[PDB]
């Protein structure tokens, strides 16, 4: 009664009076611009997309700590005054492309790497989710891990399941998008990726399939020989040009890290080397059982037979035989897939592309 009349009543009345004063500031004569520089005199020069020049003062609700060069502030049409700081107009429009919040992945499909899975967890999942581990002991957690191995081992799926446990934004980078040839432009795009990761501080940085130009391998976007120097050394200048104790963790992954520049490896940031291998026959039943959980199997079909037949195959090859055997019975409109479809699937998918060494016995 007494407190509610002296608090709630003047609060709702003051908020309505502040909006009335915005008619001379945020009212219809309103425009925007691009901030250039700020001076200690409470004045700045801002250029709108129509390329004018406006030198005015700074209004309320905003300080100079939030005003940075290159951003977009808010202007006025008549008085031309700077209102306040705002985010990127229309936004960069980067929401989910290489980045997301909580991807859906488990440890069953990546099974078989458990020997090397405990290495990435303790160096990434443990320090990020449990920061008290390295703080109480005073040790420095690994600031990055390198990924090397044959494809099909779930290289992307390895860090995908870790991102769901950390409950943080998981960044990715395509190797071919940084080397795009417009004019130069190679190092310019690299800075914009790490700049966004510094504002919100997701504390997760990952790169999938590092390629650049080893030799050629491109047509539309080439870059020449000068692109190799300005690209591969730009990723080095991120860790070498800045010292970040506990936040940015850079993780690099590709098919072959040997041909890469030893300077690009940046020793001392990545203290862990993880090797990828194909899963053994013991872990194939976990992946096969998931895809066949919704599949109708006949009485003569045994799961232990398909696992024994598989020799030197990736994780995608387990679901490939289930897809091929499922389409054979789908064309004939059968409920339970016959054992003949499973036999023809495991034999065909085994040898398709390269049947023979083409020369000698090797």
């Amino acid at each position: 009664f007494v407190s509610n009349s002296e608090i709630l009543k003047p609060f709702e009345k003051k908020q309505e009076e502040e909006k009335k004063q915005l008619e001379e500031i945020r009212g219809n004569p309103l425009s925007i611009g691009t901030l250039e520089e700020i001076i200690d005199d409470d004045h700045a020069i801002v250029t709108s997309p129509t390329m004018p020049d406006y030198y005015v003062s700074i209004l309320s609700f905003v300080d100079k700590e939030l005003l940075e060069p290159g951003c977009s502030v808010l202007l006025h049409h008549k008085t031309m005054s700077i209102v306040g700081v705002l985010q990127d107009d229309a936004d960069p429009m980067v929401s989910v492309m290489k980045m997301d919040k909580s991807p859906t992945e488990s440890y069953s499909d990546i099974g078989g790497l458990e020997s090397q899975i405990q290495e990435i967890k303790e160096s990434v999942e443990l320090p990020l989710t449990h920061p008290e581990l390295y703080e109480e002991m005073g040790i420095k957690p690994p600031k990055g891990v390198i990924l090397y191995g044959a494809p099909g081992t779930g290289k992307t799926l390895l860090a995908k399941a870790v991102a769901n446990q950390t409950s943080a934004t998981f960044l990715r980078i395509v190797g071919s998008e940084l080397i795009q040839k417009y004019l130069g432009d190679g190092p310019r795009l690299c800075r914009q990726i790490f700049k966004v990761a510094g504002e919100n501080a997701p504390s997760i940085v990952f790169i999938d399939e590092i390629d650049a130009i080893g030799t050629k391998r491109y047509d539309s976007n080439s870059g020449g020989e000068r692109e190799i120097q300005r690209t591969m050394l730009e990723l080095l200048n991120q860790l070498d040009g800045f010292d970040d104790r506990g936040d940015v963790k850079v993780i690099m992954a590709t098919n072959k890290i040997e041909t890469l520049d030893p300077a690009l490896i940046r020793p001392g940031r990545i203290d862990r080397k993880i090797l990828f291998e194909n899963p053994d026959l013991s872990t194939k039943k976990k992946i096969l059982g998931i895809h066949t959980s919704k599949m109708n199997l006949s009485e003569d079909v045994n799961l232990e037979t398909l696992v024994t037949t598989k020799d030197d195959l990736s994780g995608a090859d387990i679901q490939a035989m289930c897809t091929e055997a499922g389409l054979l019975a789908l064309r004939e409109r059968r409920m339970q897939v016959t054992a003949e479809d499973f036999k023809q699937a495991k034999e065909r998918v085994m040898k398709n592309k390269v049947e023979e060494n083409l020369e000698g016995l090797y």
Partner: protein, 51 residues
């Protein structure tokens, strides 16, 4: 009488300066909308009371 009144009512509409063209970008709770004009730049304007 209806033809002359119609032509007279349409006369003040042509004498009106008219309006620009733009596209809505984003909206807020302040009733201020960002409209991107093709020839001009982006302008944050207040919505009408009818909408």
């Amino acid at each position: 009488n209806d033809k002359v009144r119609f032509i007279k009512d349409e006369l003040r509409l042509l004498q009106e300066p008219g309006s620009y063209v733009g596209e809505v970008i984003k909206i807020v709770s302040d009733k201020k909308v960002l409209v991107k004009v093709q020839p001009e730049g982006k302008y944050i304007v207040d919505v009408a009371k009818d909408i």
